């Protein structure tokens, strides 16, 4: 048939619940394509994955592949305007994003289903002929430099690059993947390298259609999607570039049996055990790596962790295989260290090898593999509908490793149990291959070496072959036993018929003094899953810094005890998260509705009857101590968001105030607090999914009767159900709170333009304005001025009040970031008065499409309802009401809103700024307006007292 089509694969195996339709094909120029047709999709999406990563960088220009990723967005010869691509998506309810791994460079986007072609056409040009404009090159190089800059003090990246640095220096694995201003601009200017043609040469040499894979998802039929792809991608040239494989391992003999001691930025204690293994990619169907991991990294009774934790050496454990590249992989066992654990590191590793030998003594087990295979089958069958944008990216990446007919099922289903392969991998997990790394600040001043790229303080030793054979002669431990049978494996996948009196939105089926139960039977997804959400309210949770700490430790200790039990449930697709809020506790249970009532009770009555292990108590507490202290090493832009929330909230305890009162937290004071907390509660719940009305009423009534029995819980007064308000800023005012991040060498800033209380009128005023300034904010502040890699714009919502906020991380002082934003805001208003009515209407429809997008997953829908519940506005039909109002707005409705609320000389301008200074800081463009003199907040407590407190938003429904 088609000359542009090499072949068309057979039926793409999918889940029977999947109502999308799939067609796989391969183009003449070698591009593997998967077409997904979903006539319901509001946001059409597409993605392309090139099988070339940062392992293929030129030895001199580190991270050239990463740099090229950034540059493809900034223009092609067909669409020459620098921000043509980004502007188009933003004007049609779409977004875009990309990344560069060791072997892949993945690009993706979504867009309104009516404009799939218009975006795909511009997206296709990325590989045909990119401009690689030099003025854009010398600007965007700072974005890469700033992107790497925010990671220099990140303990994760410092360790990730260190592992690469302690291997064979000439193996591509030791390369610097990110790149910076030094490798891209500074050095190539010294040595005299034309960076632009180095880019152009890399594109024609590696971005061949041979190594590409395209996934397109649209409302269009499978046949029309075929025509669309062969029109825009069949022209992409083919260089027949061989797929880069790296057979020889980066970790050879001289790198083995080596001990590393590393100084971190945070106060953390970690033990990193690693083994070199062959590329187990081709054995993916038996999957021996996942098998060995599942048993090692197990957290149930008799596991490696359950012993290493019950004697207080480690709290968390992670095992399994780690992808390196085509030709080599790793097998790792990473653990958290306690204060006592750090001293007994070599005995931890002993217990590791004692467990490895236990698997060797009993050999492979088919029943273990079978229930893994079984659970994966159920997991795949009832797989939640993925969001179009993330779906096409995920598939396009694995569209290389697998046949067309297997791509959806390849990494889920397992077919033939192969114990012989399980033996092989386990055979490589022996002491003569171990690579140990200890991360603690007890090594400061005890190091020789420094990692070049990050400045990581460490040193390389040789594991005494003294110690090696003690590990080799590991005696079989008696406390190590293989997992028992999983009782939490779901059997009843029955979908209960939609009740006669069912409702489109959650309904209040129970309303007492103690409970307020919201219920809605699932009508859109029809999977055997339920979402159980509970909020327990009690004024004694956050009345002072002391009770706040104890509420945290209480829930942290409760989760710690349930961990062994609840682990088998999580594997069986049934999970829960329990955490403390500023109003009490939050309990969420998600997964298969079969054995939910089982887990829910084992949570509640365990919660009402807690029996604190004080051994654990001071370990968790000690971890909490370092947790609060480690906030000093967080990102500057995070410190900004943290301070603003502290400023604008009626009551909020600081990190310092908490760790100050943490020393006052003793065990008897804590167990005098738990019944005090559970003495009087108010429970507001949302039960959503595969449950009937009396099923939900039975679930709630069961929760109460457990608390009423084991805690003697009684109802709270309606008077005591008070929620915190937001500080009301004065007209024409400006406040500035300034601090300094001691760790990061970058600055941070958040600029909150408080507008008014939340309402249909005010919300769509703000949301539309944020929609219009959405792309230009990124284009002006980052693409052009290059203030920083992190530039964010959008609405802020807290305690029923809203406003417009800017967030920028930079190396410029925050006061300069201040001016450039204000200069940009005058640039925007002038851009509004001058844009066409059809341009303005083009923005309205975009915002409408973005907010009418239906949830794909069950929990996705539950989130919105719960969002209307905890905010206590209960506007369940919010999206329809406010979009209808949105389309009635005109240009001067927005202009008048700007001149009144946001303008530099607006009568009702409410502005507050947070200035986080860098570690070392003191004190062509449009011209910034003259700013009023800012009132500097010196004390937060006195700040709040001077200003009024906003009202609380009235509930949409009267009770």
């Amino acid at each position: 048939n088609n000359p542009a089509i090499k072949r068309i694969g057979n039926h793409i195996t999918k889940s029977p619940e999947d109502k999308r339709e799939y067609r796989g094909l391969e183009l003449a120029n070698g591009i593997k394509v998967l077409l997904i047709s979903d006539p319901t999709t509001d946001k059409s999406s597409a993605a392309l994955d090139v099988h070339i990563g940062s392992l293929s960088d030129p030895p001199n220009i580190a991270g050239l592949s990463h740099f090229l990723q950034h540059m493809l967005f900034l223009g092609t010869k067909k669409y020459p305007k620098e921000n043509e691509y980004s502007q188009f998506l933003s004007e049609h309810a779409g977004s875009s994003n990309a990344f560069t791994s060791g072997e892949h460079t993945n690009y993706y986007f979504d867009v309104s289903h009516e404009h799939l072609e218009g975006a795909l056409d511009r997206f296709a040009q990325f590989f045909l002929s990119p401009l690689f404009d030099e003025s854009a090159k010398d600007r965007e190089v700072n974005a890469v430099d700033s992107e790497h800059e925010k990671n220099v003090m990140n303990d994760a990246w410092r360790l990730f690059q260190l592992e690469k640095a302690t291997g064979n220096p000439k193996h591509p694995f030791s390369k610097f993947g990110t790149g910076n201003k030094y490798t891209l601009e500074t050095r190539p200017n010294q040595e005299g390298i034309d960076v632009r043609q180095e880019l152009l040469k890399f594109h024609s040499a590696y971005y061949s259609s041979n190594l590409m894979a395209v996934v397109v998802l649209g409302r269009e039929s499978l046949d029309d999607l075929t025509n669309l792809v062969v029109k825009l991608f069949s022209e992409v040239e083919n260089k027949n570039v061989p797929l880069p494989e790296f057979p020889e391992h980066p970790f050879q003999e001289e790198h083995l049996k080596q001990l590393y001691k590393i100084v971190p930025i945070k106060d953390i204690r970690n033990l990193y055990v690693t083994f070199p293994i062959p590329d187990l990619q081709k054995y993916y169907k038996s999957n021996p790596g996942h098998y060995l991991g599942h048993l090692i990294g197990h957290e149930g009774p008799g596991s490696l962790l359950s012993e290493l934790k019950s004697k207080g050496w480690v709290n968390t454990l992670v095992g399994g295989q780690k992808e390196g590249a085509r030709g080599f992989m790793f097998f790792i066992i990473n653990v958290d260290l306690t204060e006592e654990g750090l001293l007994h590191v070599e005995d931890i590793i002993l217990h590791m090898f004692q467990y490895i030998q236990k698997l060797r003594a009993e050999g492979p087990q088919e029943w273990v593999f079978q229930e893994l295979k079984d659970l994966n089958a159920v997991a795949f069958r009832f797989k939640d509908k993925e969001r179009p944008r993330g779906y096409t990216s995920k598939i396009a990446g694995i569209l290389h490793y697998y046949p067309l007919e297997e791509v959806l099922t390849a990494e889920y289903l397992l077919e033939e149990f192969r114990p012989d392969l399980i033996e092989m991998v386990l055979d490589k997990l022996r002491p003569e291959n171990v690579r140990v790394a200890i991360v603690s600040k007890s090594f400061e001043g005890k190091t020789d070496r420094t990692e070049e790229w990050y400045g990581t303080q460490y040193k390389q030793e040789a594991i005494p072959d003294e110690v090696i054979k003690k590990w080799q002669n590991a005696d079989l431990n008696g406390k190590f036993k293989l997992p028992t049978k999983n009782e939490f494996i779901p059997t009843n996948f029955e979908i209960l018929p939609l009740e006669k009196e069912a409702t489109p939105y959650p309904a209040l089926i129970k309303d007492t003094a103690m409970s307020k139960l919201w219920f809605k039977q699932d009508d859109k997804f029809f999977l055997p899953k339920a979402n159980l959400n509970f909020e327990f309210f009690s004024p004694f949770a956050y009345v002072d810094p002391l009770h706040s700490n104890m509420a945290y430790l209480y829930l942290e200790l409760l989760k710690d005890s349930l961990n062994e039990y609840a682990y088998a449930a999580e594997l069986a697709g049934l999970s829960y998260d329990l955490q403390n809020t500023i109003y009490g506790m939050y309990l969420s249970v998600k997964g298969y509705n079969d054995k939910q009532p089982i887990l829910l009770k084992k949570i509640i009555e365990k919660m009402a009857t807690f029996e604190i292990d004080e051994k654990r108590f001071e370990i968790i507490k000690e971890a909490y101590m370092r947790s609060l202290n480690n906030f000093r090493a967080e990102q500057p832009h995070q410190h900004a968001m943290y301070y603003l929330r502290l400023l604008m909230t009626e009551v909020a305890w600081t990190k310092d105030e908490l760790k100050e009162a943490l020393d006052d937290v003793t065990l008897p004071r804590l167990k005098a607090f738990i019944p005090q907390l559970l003495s009087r509660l108010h429970i507001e719940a949302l039960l959503h999914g595969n449950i009937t009305k009396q099923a939900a009423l039975g679930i709630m009534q069961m929760v109460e009767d457990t608390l009423i029995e084991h805690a003697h819980t009684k109802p709270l007064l309606p008077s005591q159900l008070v929620r915190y308000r937001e500080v009301q800023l004065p007209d024409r005012g400006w406040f500035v709170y300034q601090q300094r991040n001691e760790v990061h060498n970058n600055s941070g800033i958040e600029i909150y333009y408080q507008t008014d209380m939340q309402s249909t009128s005010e919300n769509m005023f703000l949301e539309l304005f944020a929609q219009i300034i959405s792309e230009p904010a990124f284009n002006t502040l980052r693409t052009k001025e290059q203030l920083g890699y992190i530039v964010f714009s959008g609405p802020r919502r807290a305690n029923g009040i809203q406003g417009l906020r800017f967030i920028i991380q930079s190396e410029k002082p925050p006061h300069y970031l201040e001016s450039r934003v204000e200069a940009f805001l005058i640039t925007m208003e002038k851009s509004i008065e001058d844009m066409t009515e059809e341009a303005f209407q083009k923005h309205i429809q975009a915002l409408a499409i973005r907010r009418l997008d239906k949830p794909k997953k069950l929990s996705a829908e539950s989130a919105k309802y719960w969002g209307e519940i905890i905010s206590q506005q209960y506007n369940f039909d919010r999206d329809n009401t406010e979009v209808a109002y949105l389309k009635t707005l005109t240009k001067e409705d927005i202009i008048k809103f700007y001149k009144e609320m946001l303008a530099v000389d607006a009568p009702r301008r409410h502005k507050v700024s947070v200035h986080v200074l860098a570690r070392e800081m003191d004190s062509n463009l449009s011209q910034a307006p003259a700013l009023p003199q800012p009132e500097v907040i010196q004390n937060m407590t006195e700040f709040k007292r001077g200003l009024p407190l906003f009202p609380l938003v009235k509930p949409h429904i009267n009770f």
Partner: peptide, 7 residues
């Protein structure tokens, strides 16, 4: 448990 702009 087991294992799970740019990377």
């Amino acid at each position: 448990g087991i294992v799970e702009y740019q990377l």
